[PDB]
Amino acid sequence: DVQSAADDTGLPMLVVRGPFNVVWQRLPAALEKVGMKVTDSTRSQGNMAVTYKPLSDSDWQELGASDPGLASGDYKLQVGDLDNRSSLQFIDPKGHTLTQSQNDALVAVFQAAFSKPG
Numbered sequence: 001d002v003q004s005a006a007d008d009t010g011l012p013m014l015v016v017r018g019p020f021n022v023v024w025q026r027l028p029a030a031l032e033k034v035g036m037k038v039t040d041s042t043r044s045q046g047n048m049a050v051t052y053k054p055l056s057d058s059d060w061q062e063l064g065a066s067d068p069g070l071a072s073g074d075y076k077l078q079v080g081d082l083d084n085r086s087s088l089q090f091i092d093p094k095g096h097t098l099t100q101s102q103n104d105a106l107v108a109v110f111q112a113a114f115s116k117p118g
Helices: 020-033 057-063 100-115
Strands: 002-006 010-017 036-042 047-052 073-081 085-091
Touching: 002 100, 010 020, 010 100, 020 036, 020 047, 020 073, 020 085, 020 100, 057 100, 085 100
Parallel strands: none
Antiparallel strands: 002 010, 010 085, 036 047, 047 073, 073 085
């Protein structure tokens, strides 16, 4: 399950159902379903490096999700441990964070991704 939230600085944030050890390790599974392929990761930092490419309308139909509002490019993912949950934030290719509206879209997209058999 994915919910929308904001972090300590008031920046766009997503909260994913499950502690760091649960989500971060199984995040790649959901990532592959949303057209975002994991290229590297560091467990000692809670950081992940990914490459994203927009999928087709029929691709999103198979996933059961809408347009995430993300454009093609390399993304940097940051995952923190909330104890019972995971704090997931998205950094765009430009070195900036994604908007609340983009993350709100990602809610449903990853909601389907985690439910999607894989």
